[PDB]
Enzyme design. Structure first.
Site, PDB file in Angstrom:
ATOM      1  N   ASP A  74       1.593 -11.120  -0.610  1.00 43.40           N
ATOM      2  CA  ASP A  74       0.326 -11.661  -1.086  1.00 43.40           C
ATOM      3  C   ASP A  74       0.167 -13.129  -0.713  1.00 43.40           C
ATOM      4  OD1 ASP A  74       2.294 -12.608  -2.729  1.00 43.40           O
ATOM      5  OD2 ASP A  74       1.271 -12.154  -4.614  1.00 43.40           O
ATOM      6  N   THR A 133      -4.490  -7.031  -7.792  1.00 46.96           N
ATOM      7  CA  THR A 133      -4.744  -5.593  -7.783  1.00 46.96           C
ATOM      8  C   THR A 133      -4.737  -5.001  -9.186  1.00 46.96           C
ATOM      9  OG1 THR A 133      -3.774  -5.394  -5.573  1.00 46.96           O
ATOM     10  CG2 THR A 133      -3.953  -3.384  -6.883  1.00 46.96           C
ATOM     11  N   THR A 134      -3.853  -5.483 -10.062  1.00 44.39           N
ATOM     12  CA  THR A 134      -3.876  -5.049 -11.454  1.00 44.39           C
ATOM     13  C   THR A 134      -5.191  -5.418 -12.129  1.00 44.39           C
ATOM     14  OG1 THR A 134      -1.470  -5.252 -11.600  1.00 44.39           O
ATOM     15  CG2 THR A 134      -2.702  -5.222 -13.664  1.00 44.39           C
ATOM     16  N   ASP A 157       4.939  -6.085 -10.368  1.00 44.57           N
ATOM     17  CA  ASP A 157       3.908  -5.995  -9.343  1.00 44.57           C
ATOM     18  C   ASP A 157       3.055  -4.750  -9.556  1.00 44.57           C
ATOM     19  OD1 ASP A 157       2.760  -6.889  -6.669  1.00 44.57           O
ATOM     20  OD2 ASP A 157       3.450  -4.870  -6.149  1.00 44.57           O
TER      21      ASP A 157
END
Lengths: 49, 50, 520, 517, 479, 98
Positions: free
Chosen positions: C385, C87-88, C54
């Protein structure tokens, strides 16, 4: 500063307060910026430059 | 709260009911002094309990 | 003061040093992007070891001294309230914009002029996402397609085995606490807990607040159908302090004297429960053997040793209030619920308290069972998420096909709009096109395939074969066109990935100096 | 200045080498102990010379050694689960998981992506697992053949141990203990006694669940229809597990008052015990002589000095209950025992039951010169009772000694014929690691490994599924005739645990170490 | 080849550290061995030729070399003789394994090969031995006297030998029991008198005095092992002391093994206190709430006999309890007189103990080692495989014992062992090295013999140590 | 048998190095192409080969690619005899130059 927090802004009056240069002639221009705030309140970047 | 508390150590069981009430009395007094002046809006810097 | 030994970095080399520090974070997370992304080893300061792919968890665990590197971490707090999944992809996109900006600084282009090019090309990419977007729940609210979408997001985690059952729970949980028409869903009203043991297929949906505490006595009634809840900070017994009572008994004369005073306090507070009409009594502390003896005769179940923060969570969910003393008891301060049961786990003595409303409510709590604490912890983030995916579909049901089809289709339009800008910002628009190609490129690299041959092949398909965007298969599925693979990400998430990445690049380019004193 | 002051992060190149080198060093450490001919090892703690010792056990070495590498720590934790659950194959899991990582490192130098290697090992694992299922041979009937297989498995587990010389007499002890069980594989039913004196061949066995402990001073040697009741509380004196409480004594008469108050408190406790209507009493704490006489006057046998393992075992063997609270009478279940007799084995008073409810239990009495011999004798015997109890649940057996390890490597090779491009090379290294187990066994025995292992490939290529290594004569022969076999659940557990352990290391490309406190 | 990983480096480190110890003690072997000078860390300088004493003062830090130190201690416990010979034999075996490991032979093959040579070596020494009778006290006297002549005191060996023989024959049934407990015989030495005065006591004799208790005699004893308020406490302290005495009085115990001096005198209880635990074990086998009569011993007449040279001793006879125990009283002028007198008794008891377990006599002076090396060479020709060279290396390593005795005797070490080998080929084991006459002579006529257990335990214990060292792959430092 | 088994595998591995180098000089992926040929010739399809024009695997009989038998037989024998002489020589004796 020494606390680790970062101050971000283009304000010339705020930057000169945080520098605190030990050179005697440099302290003169810093003191003129302080008198610029009481008389007007802006233009410290223009006066110094 | 971290600021205003009440700590009293007694060996009397009947005094425990008063100490618990006295700790609530100080809070009730601070709430009454606001009502005594008739202030409708209360703006506090520190948090206010439920 | 403290001018000596003050670290200073200024000039053109300052910008190239900030980009290098930013690329160190982007090159680290780009290997974990996608479902096939490699994991990361985490060694806690106390000696704990955990493994997760994550991205939001990695940025929280990374300790970086450099100032610009700290700004990249602060972005995660803003995006997790919206996406919480890709988000990455924003950090990778932010690193690509800065990497291509290094080639432009050698040509003599001013940094502010470069930042204006990204902002101009960002609105073109956002506008192109609105044309190719398709809807699902438009004009008709249905739970059938909504459940299938959540089944794909859980496929990238370790919960991919039980992934099908946990999808229906997140749908009924969000629709219970809020209406889809309201388009307002608060994450504070949704709680997630778990305990070791069992399997991930045992996840259930309980409407209410749940905490793990036992009853005051095991023979107390296990089922309360009517709703009466007494929530107090003190147990029912002669008043005892918060630490140690320490009763003083000199001899038998004081024993028989104080016992009669205690005996009057035994029957007074226990019979006081029926005076207010209450049934279940929630107290912060436990009961004595005599207190539980009177509850069995009157059939008054109760919970003992309730935690401090647990008292506030029960009063809010059940609709009750915190009662400091039995003197303030009334009918309005009683909490409501449909059922109260005690459900144990295997042979374990936990016996978590179960508060069921037997109807809809404004707050729900999802409980997870599993054989490993680290898997349950990753299962908690698996639903985090997932709730955002459902929440985004409630706000806007328009979606864009993911798997790299969105980023590749945007660079085709941005590259064409570049020739319409007779100005130096044209180079920034071209560099913005190659930066969008990095996210779909990192997906193929993590799959063990040639990155460049896969990227250019999809470009020719979208221009020639068909106008709709085609994606890249990182799971080694049958073929491209993820529309059949049902890999879909919300449109709101796509607009935030470009907007948040533009903010970071604009702030890094406009900072030409970093000052800080050293140890004197 | 990304990570400083204790915080270290190895990059993709260095964390790659660090992950394997740390894990391979663990596998290369205990690989010398594989097989009955395996080497010994010396363990000495730094700063203390009293930790000197020599043991060939691969499980003991990994427990005492420290591991500062988080990549190697995962491999150590997977080895302790193998010893605690199944009990056999602790060395096999560590060696096989290390060989998979040693071959995976050479594949990365070929620019083979780690995710592709993982996809290859998953398909090869299913093919290697089906090979054991096709070669597994159980026995529904012919308990003689079933008992003979238990002796071969027990003799195999006891190999490379301290008892390996005398194991021929010990195979009759371990098998008979499990044979008399004939039921659920609970190991608490079989008690283990360790007594000083006598050689290893003097170890006896008792089928009536013999107790290792002595009770009381003067106790009846025989009782008819004794009801078993366990309780937990101090039976000796006042102030049990109470620290900080004192007693003011101004003279000798105050001590006599305590003696009267003690007898008064013990009397009330004996009354509540006698209200249960029991002929026998059990407690963990020691029993004082005054309540012992109160138990002997009523015929109640006083049992004292029980441990935590006693209460759990005495409940299931006699059909009783823990019953920590004896206060409320006749609310607890009582045990059933036909006879309780006193047997003296090893110059010690021991308790022998008879005709207990579910009397399939038993007890093995070890005999040794010192305690260190008895401790290693119990660890080697307990590991044997684990696999024998598992054999009762699943009677499928496979041939060991390089027979099963080479057969799985052959099925993976045939799978490499039908496969895509990159998965072909990945599964070949998986088959090579399976052939490393019979290779290391030959090296520890001094025999030529390249000669013996390569002939096994040609042997299992065309027919001859039962071929294997013979350590006695140093040649290749039938494993069924020589009587070398192991349980099926052991091979499936070692095969899957080694594949899951090596899979986690490949999934980690970077190691983030925070600043130590 | 390659040999990237070299575990044999620790093997060579273990052989080098073990050989350094055997090479040191080698020169101290035999009566003619050279003396050694050991200087203590405090600056004290001592000179002794005893091998068992030097090994304790070496302070060996190496793990593998400590095993040889413990090997010498295990030799003194069983046989009690040949401490130096065991270390030398174990050192020559590891030195012979160096040439074998360079040829590529695996240690497990070497370890298993020494076991077959050990089983064959025991049969060789047994067939060539001389069976003797244990019930005969003439052989026990001559075997002990000639053995103690090579010890420190050769003049008084004739006196102390029958004291040890009559003690063992009393506590052990002749030609019946195969086990002898040396702890069942206690030796008490005191200053004053002379060695000519010795007393063998069938009961127990201790060093303690009954002071200040003045009873001094107890017949038919059962022995066992275990301002107003200020004056009132003194009366209460007497109550607590007497309370524990009352429980002892009910059982009938007249002797206790440890203001109360007067209470024990009123009950006529002899005071025996300040007793060592090792001394209790001698009394344990011979004869408060947990104190009962069943754990009490028995005695006939207890008393303290104070002589001129034996000091204050407690003479208790007629224990009347199951067992066999005796006691020896030793007198002498100075402390060094009684010290060597007792040390000669331990050496006498160990030799007798070896004769009880194994009844046989073999010649000395390097004779058992040469005859062993002669037959194992022919036995190695019948073997096949790697066991051919392994047995020959085990046989050639036995040549260090005779070559060392010949070197300390001034003769030629190489020429001596060569001439003796052909003497054992044509003749018997009787040939050997005579250190008294300084030349090759028949040892049978020299009356130099040693019990069989010394040579057998030397080969058995040393082989198990050599096999244990070869099986070590490496060492791991834990924490 | 055992010792001759390892020597043959290295001999067969060298034959697979020829199509590997051909693919490397063409800029293609040798790991995929060589592995697919080994799987193709493992069961049937004896005519499969490499196509340098299209960059894939196709039938050599259809594409019209063939070589003489006398050439391949000579390359096979001359390579084995050349490596046999170098492997047999364990020492080199050099003299003084004239």
């Amino acid at each position: 500063d020494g606390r680790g927090k970062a101050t971000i802004s283009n304000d010339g009056a705020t930057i000169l307060k945080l520098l605190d240069v030990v050179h005697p002639a440099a302290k003169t221009l810093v003191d003129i910026a302080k008198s610029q705030d009481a008389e007007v309140g802006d233009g410290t970047t223009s006066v110094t430059l | 709260a971290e600021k205003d508390n009440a700590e009293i150590r007694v060996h009397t069981v009947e005094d425990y009911q008063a100490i618990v009430d006295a700790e609530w009395n100080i809070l009730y007094d601070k709430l009454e002094k606001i009502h005594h002046s008739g202030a409708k809006v209360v703006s506090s810097k520190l948090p206010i309990g439920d | 003061k403290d001018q000596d030994r003050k670290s200073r970095l200024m000039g053109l080399e300052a910008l190239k040093s900030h980009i290098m520090a930013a690329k160190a974070v982007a090159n680290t997370m780009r290997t974990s992007l996608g479902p096939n992304g490699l994991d990361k080893m985490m060694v806690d300061k106390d000696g704990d070891v955990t493994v997760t792919n994550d991205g939001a968890t990695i940025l929280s665990m990374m300790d970086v001294d450099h100032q610009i590197a700290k700004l990249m971490v602060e972005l995660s707090k803003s995006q997790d309230d919206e996406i919480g999944d890709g988000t990455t992809g924003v950090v990778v996109l932010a690193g690509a914009l800065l990497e291509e900006a290094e080639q432009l600084l050698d040509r003599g282009i001013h940094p502010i002029r470069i930042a204006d090019g990204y902002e101009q090309a960002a609105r073109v990419a956002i506008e192109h996402l609105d044309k190719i977007s398709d809807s699902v729940l438009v004009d008709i609210k249905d739970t059938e397609p909504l459940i299938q979408t959540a089944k794909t997001t859980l496929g990238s985690k370790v919960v991919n085995s039980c992934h099908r059952q946990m999808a229906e729970i997140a749908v009924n949980a969000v629709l219970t606490v809020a209406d889809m028409e309201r388009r307002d869903v608060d994450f504070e009203l949704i709680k997630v807990e778990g305990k070791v043991g069992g399997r991930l297929e045992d996840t259930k949906l309980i409407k209410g607040v749940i905490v793990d505490k036992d009853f005051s006595h095991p023979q107390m009634p296990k089922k309360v159908e009517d709703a009466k809840i007494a929530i107090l900070t003190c147990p029912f017994e002669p008043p005892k302090p918060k630490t140690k009572h320490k009763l003083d008994v000199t001899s038998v004369e004081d024993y028989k004297a104080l016992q009669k005073y205690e005996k009057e306090k035994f029957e007074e507070m226990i019979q006081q429960i029926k005076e207010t009409g209450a049934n279940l009594a929630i107290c912060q502390w436990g009961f004595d053997d005599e207190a539980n003896h009177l509850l069995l005769q009157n059939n008054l179940p109760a919970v003992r040793w309730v935690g401090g923060p647990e008292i506030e969570l029960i009063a809010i969910a059940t609709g009750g209030r915190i009662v400091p003393r039995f003197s303030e008891l009334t009918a309005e301060k009683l909490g409501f619920a449909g059922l109260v049961q005690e459900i144990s786990f295997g042979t374990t003595k936990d016996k978590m308290l179960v508060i069921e409303q037997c109807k809809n409510s404004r707050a729900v709590t999802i409980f997870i069972r599993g054989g490993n604490k680290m898997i349950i912890e990753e299962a908690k983030r698996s639903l985090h998420d997932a709730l955002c995916v459902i929440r985004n579909l409630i706000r806007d049901n328009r979606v864009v096909y993911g798997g790299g089809a969105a980023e590749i289709s945007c660079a085709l339009a941005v590259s064409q709009e570049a020739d319409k800008c007779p100005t130096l910002e044209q180079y920034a628009m071209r560099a913005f096109a190659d930066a969008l190609e990095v996210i779909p490129m990192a997906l193929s690299e993590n799959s063990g395939m040639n990155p460049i041959q896969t990227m250019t092949e999809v470009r020719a398909r979208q221009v020639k074969e068909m106008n709709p965007a085609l994606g890249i298969d990182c799971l080694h599925k049958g073929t491209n066109d993820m529309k059949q693979q049902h890999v879909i990400e919300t449109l709101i998430g796509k607009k935030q990935q470009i907007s948040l990445a533009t903010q970071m690049v604009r702030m890094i380019l406009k900072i030409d100096d970093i000052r800080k004193p050293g140890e004197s | 200045n990304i990570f400083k002051a204790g915080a270290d992060e190895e990059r993709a190149e260095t964390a790659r080498l660090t992950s394997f080198i740390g894990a391979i060093a663990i596998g290369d450490l205990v690989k010398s102990t594989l097989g009955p001919k395996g080497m010994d090892k010396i363990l000495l703690s730094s700063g203390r010379d009293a930790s000197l010792m020599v043991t060939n056990d691969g499980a003991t070495i990994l427990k005492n050694i420290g591991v500062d590498n988080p990549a190697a720590k995962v491999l150590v934790d997977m080895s302790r689960v193998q010893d605690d659950e199944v009990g056999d194959g602790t060395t096999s899991v560590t060696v096989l998981a290390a060989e998979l990582l040693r071959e995976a490192e050479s594949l990365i130098a070929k620019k083979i992506h780690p995710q592709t290697i993982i996809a290859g090992w998953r398909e090869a694992t299913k093919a290697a697992r089906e090979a054991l299922l096709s070669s597994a041979v159980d026995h529904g009937s012919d308990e003689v053949k079933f008992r003979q297989d238990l002796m071969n498995i027990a003799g195999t587990t006891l190999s490379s141990k301290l008892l390996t010389h005398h194991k021929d007499h010990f195979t009759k002890l371990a098998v008979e203990a499990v044979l008399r069980l004939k039921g659920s594989g609970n190991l608490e039913a079989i008690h283990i006694i360790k007594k000083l004196g006598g050689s290893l061949a003097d170890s006896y066995l008792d089928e009536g669940f013999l107790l290792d402990k002595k009770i009381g001073v003067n106790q009846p040697k025989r009782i008819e229809n004794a009801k078993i009741l366990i309780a937990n509380t101090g039976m000796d004196t006042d102030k049990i597990k109470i620290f900080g409480s004192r007693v003011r004594v101004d003279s000798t008469a105050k001590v006599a008052e305590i003696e009267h108050a003690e007898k008064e408190k013990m009397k009330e406790k004996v009354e509540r015990i006698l209200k249960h209507g029991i002929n026998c009493f059990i407690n963990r704490q020691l029993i004082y002589n005054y309540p012992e006489q109160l138990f002997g006057a009523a015929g109640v046998m006083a049992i004292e000095h029980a441990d935590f393992a006693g209460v759990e075992r005495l409940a299931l063997v006699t059909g009783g209950e823990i019953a920590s609270t004896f206060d409320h009478p006749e609310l607890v279940k009582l045990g059933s025992c036909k006879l309780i007799e006193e047997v003296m084995i090893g110059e010690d008073k021991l308790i022998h039951f008879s005709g207990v409810a579910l009397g399939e239990a038993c007890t093995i009495v070890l005999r040794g010169a010192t305690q260190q011999i008895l401790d290693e004798a119990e660890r080697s015997l307990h590991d044997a009772l684990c696999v024998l109890a598992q054999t009762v649940k699943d009677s499928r057996t496979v041939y060991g000694g390089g027979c099963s390890e080479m057969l799985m490597a052959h099925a993976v090779t045939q799978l490499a014929n039908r496969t895509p491009g990159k998965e072909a090379v990945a599964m070949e290294s998986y088959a090579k690691a399976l052939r490393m187990l019979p290779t290391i066994i030959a090296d520890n025995a001094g025999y030529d490994s390249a000669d013996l292992v390569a002939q096994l490939r040609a042997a299992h290529s065309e027919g001859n599924t039962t071929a294997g290594l013979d350590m006695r004569e140093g040649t290749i022969g039938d494993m069924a005739i020589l009587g070398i076999t192991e349980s099926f659940q052991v091979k499936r557990q070692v095969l899957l645990s080694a594949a899951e352990a090596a899979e986690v290391i490949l999934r980690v490309d970077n190691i983030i170490k925070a600043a130590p406190r | 080849y390659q040999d990237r990983d070299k575990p044999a480096q620790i093997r060579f480190s273990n052989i080098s550290a073990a050989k350094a110890v055997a090479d040191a003690i080698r020169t101290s072997l035999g009566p003619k061995g050279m003396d050694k000078m050991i200087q203590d860390g405090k600056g004290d300088v001592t000179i002794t030729n005893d091998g068992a004493t030097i090994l304790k003062q070496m302070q060996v830090l190496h793990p593998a070399a400590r095993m040889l130190v413990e090997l010498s201690k295990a030799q003194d416990i069983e046989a009690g003789d040949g401490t130096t010979s065991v270390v030398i034999i174990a050192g020559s075996l590891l030195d012979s394994c160096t040439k074998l490991l360079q040829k590529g032979i695996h240690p497990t093959i070497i370890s298993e090969s020494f076991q077959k040579a050990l089983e064959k070596g025991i049969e060789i020494l047994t067939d060539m031995s001389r069976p003797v009778e244990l019930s005969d006290r003439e052989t026990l006297l001559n075997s002990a006297t000639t053995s103690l002549n090579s010890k420190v005191v050769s003049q008084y060996s004739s006196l102390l030998s029958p004291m040890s023989v009559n003690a063992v024959m009393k506590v052990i049934d002749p030609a019946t029991a195969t086990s002898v407990d040396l702890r069942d015989i206690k030796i008490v030495k005191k200053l004053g008198g002379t060695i000519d005065d010795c007393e063998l006591v069938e009961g127990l004799v201790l060093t303690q005095k009954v002071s200040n208790s003045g009873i001094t005699r107890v017949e038919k004893a059962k022995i066992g092992l275990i301002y107003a308020q200020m004056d009132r406490v003194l009366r209460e302290e007497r109550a607590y002391i007497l309370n524990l005495v009352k429980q002892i009085k009910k059982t009938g115990c007249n002797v206790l093994l440890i203001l109360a001096l007067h209470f024990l005198n009123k009950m006529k209880i002899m005071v025996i206190k300040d007793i060592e635990r090792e001394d209790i074990e001698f009394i344990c086998k011979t004869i408060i709430d947990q104190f009962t009569a069943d754990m009490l011993g028995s005695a006939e007449l207890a008393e303290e006999v104070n002589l001129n040279g034996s000091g204050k001793l407690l003479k208790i006879t007629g224990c009347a309890s199951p067992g066999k125990t005796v006691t020896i009283v030793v007198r002498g002028s100075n402390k060094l007189v009684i010290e060597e007198a007792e040390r000669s008794i331990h050496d006498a008891l160990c030799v007798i103990r070896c004769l009880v377990k194994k009844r046989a006599l073999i010649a000395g002076g390097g004779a058992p080692e040469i005859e062993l090396a002669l037959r194992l060479t022919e036995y190695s020709r019948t073997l096949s495989g790697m066991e051919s060279y392994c047995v020959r290396a085990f046989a050639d390593a036995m040549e260090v014992i005779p070559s060392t005795l010949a070197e300390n005797a001034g003769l030629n070490p190489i020429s001596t062992v060569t001439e003796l080998r052909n003497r054992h080929a044509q003749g018997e084991k009787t040939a050997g090295i005579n250190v008294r006459k300084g030349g090759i002579s028949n040892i049978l006529e020299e009356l130099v013999v040693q019990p069989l257990l010394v040579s057998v335990s030397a080969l058995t214990l040393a082989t198990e140590t050599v096999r244990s060292i070869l099986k070590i792959d490496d060492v791991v430092n834990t924490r």
